[PDB]
Structure 1
């Protein structure tokens, strides 16, 4: 279609590989670009880990208040919030918010441990019908984003469907579905990605990711005005391992998708 033609031209001008999945929750239509190809998730995978802990909290009703120790051996490559609480503790709610709103990797590793390793995160995806998501490693080696490597990858089509079930659907419980929505709405890392390509009036919750090979990702649930919400996944990766981030590609892909 016409939007397919604009995303392809955007991909060609970028010199990279672009994967886009849009779900319009009015007629359940889908616009896809390389929607069945695998992309390195990087820290967009933190939504699955946080949602998995939220699913646990449905049965363990005070799980999110459990304190977790932050130790110097726990710090990894990017620890904005966890660095402020070394030799102290953070609750699982605080670690989830830090993981999704500041992309703290030490917090991610705490969520993975709560679920019993990366295989516990993958388990949750399978439990909600995501047959594609796979988490094989912890922070930070899950961000190697090597071409052809299926580790820690997913397809745009599967993440869009999963992100819909987690936020708009009821893959989670009522209080949990609302908590994840509030967390995504208060992200601080995404002003230059999907948000930058959408109208100011649109309310958006998102989770960004980045890694080697210039990988630049963002997944977002979008609430327009008087309109049925949309779900958009934008994944991008490049041929050079040392390639720089291209958040502008994500902004332009969201601009094209949102009629423009």
Structure 2
């Protein structure tokens, strides 16, 4: 069989779940896919796209990243490490968007969705505008994390996530300046050490956004990877299981990424 497919099938069997992967070498055009067209829960991974929406809004001069966002009278959501620190004085819109991505800050995520993006509908509309027909955000944090098998709410496909990431980080939707900011934010992510970052050599640079639902062993990660002296790669790995109480496996995500990188054709 084609290189890497049997290896990922065996990984999936041992994991006793479902693994979706899409990888693309932007230099040669070679790719690797496995269940790339199947739906998987997004979990926090959509926050990486939320940040890009804010950058697009700044670029259109509809928003200003320097605008101070005040929320001193708003109860903050579970897991709001950055927004809790600056609740008294407030935070600039740019810093809030960065926190939503880099720390998966829920307060930052919901505040931005409520005030600037137009909620789940607005987030979905933004993705449709960049050519993404699969992405769908239906709920807010933290309800969107249920990850119920068969449920199409708050899901997308590994292929759609990869295409949207390539379009936003390396395409022409965002200007040269906004792309640099977006790439900097991705590189500064603090939650992906054990996933895609663990599958590549020490001298390769990685920009990513993780997602962990906390249910049905559902976890994921997508990234722009800049290999030493090579054009960037786009990697998207999504996983889920049928047991409600099953824990996610970071090592499975890392291994699926390693297999994809070594089998680009």
Normalised to the residue count of structure 1, the TM-score between the two structures is 0.96
Corresponding residue of 1:78: 79
Residue equivalent to 2:248: 245
Distance 1:54 1:247 in 2: 30
Instruction: Tell me, in whole angstroms, the C-alpha distance in 2 between the residues paired with 1:80 and 1:243.
Output: 26
Alignment deviations for residues 170-202 of structure 1 (CA, whole Å, 9 cap, x no partner): 221221111110000011100011111111111
Q: Find the aligned partners of 1:88 and 1:147 in 2 and give their Cα distance.
A: 42
1:102-117 correspondence to structure 2 within 5 Å: 102-113=103-114, 114-117=116-119
Give how far 1:61 is off. Answer: 7.1
Unaligned runs of 5+ in 1: none
Instruction: Sort the Cα spacing of 1:72 and 1:5 in 2 relative to 1 into closer, same or farther, 3 A.
Output: farther
* 2:22 match: 21
Partner of 2:7: 6
Deviation of residue 62 (structure 1)? 6.0
**TM-superposition CA deviations, 1:229-252 (whole Å, max 9, x none):** 110001011111121121111111
Partner of 1:136: 138
Q: 2:46 & 2:141 partners in 1: Cα distance?
A: 11
Give the number of aligned pairs.
260
Give the structure-2-normalised TM-score.
Answer: 0.94
**Comparing 227-236 and 25-34, the one that deviates more:** 25-34
1:147 aligns with 2:149: yes
Equivalents in 1 of 2:63, 2:41: separation in Å?
33
SS of the residue 2:245 aligns to: coil
1:53 deviates by 1.1
Name the counterpart of 2:238. 235
Unaligned runs of 5+ in 2: none
Q: CA deviation at 1:83?
A: 1.4
Q: Distance in 1 between matches of 2:62 and 2:34?
A: 40
Greater shift after overlay, 228-237 or 111-120? Answer: 111-120
Task: Give me the whole-angstrom Cα distance separating, in 1, the residues matched to 2:92 and 2:47.
Answer: 17
Residue 104 of structure 1 and its aligned partner are, at CA, apart by 0.6
Q: Is the contact between residue 102 and residue 187 of structure 1 (CA under 8 Å) also seen in structure 2?
A: yes
**Residue 211 of structure 2: SS of its match in structure 1?**
strand
Deviating more after overlay: 247-256 vs 180-189: 247-256
Corresponding residue SS for 2:70: strand
1:216–1:235 contact (8 Å) kept in structure 2: yes
**Secondary structure at the residue paired with 1:12?**
helix
> Which segments of structure 1 move beyond 3 Å, counting only runs of 4 or more?
71-74
| Paired residues of 1:72 and 1:87 also in contact (CA < 8 A) | no
- Aligned equivalents of 1:228 and 1:250: distance in 2? 23
For residue 132 of structure 2, give the secondary structure of its aligned residue in structure 1: coil
CA contact (8 A) 1:20 1:235 kept: yes
Query: Could you say which residue in structure 2 is the equivalent of 1:96?
Result: 97
Aligned partner of 1:190 among 189, 192, 199: 192
CA offset at residue 142 of structure 1? 1.0
RMSD: 1.4
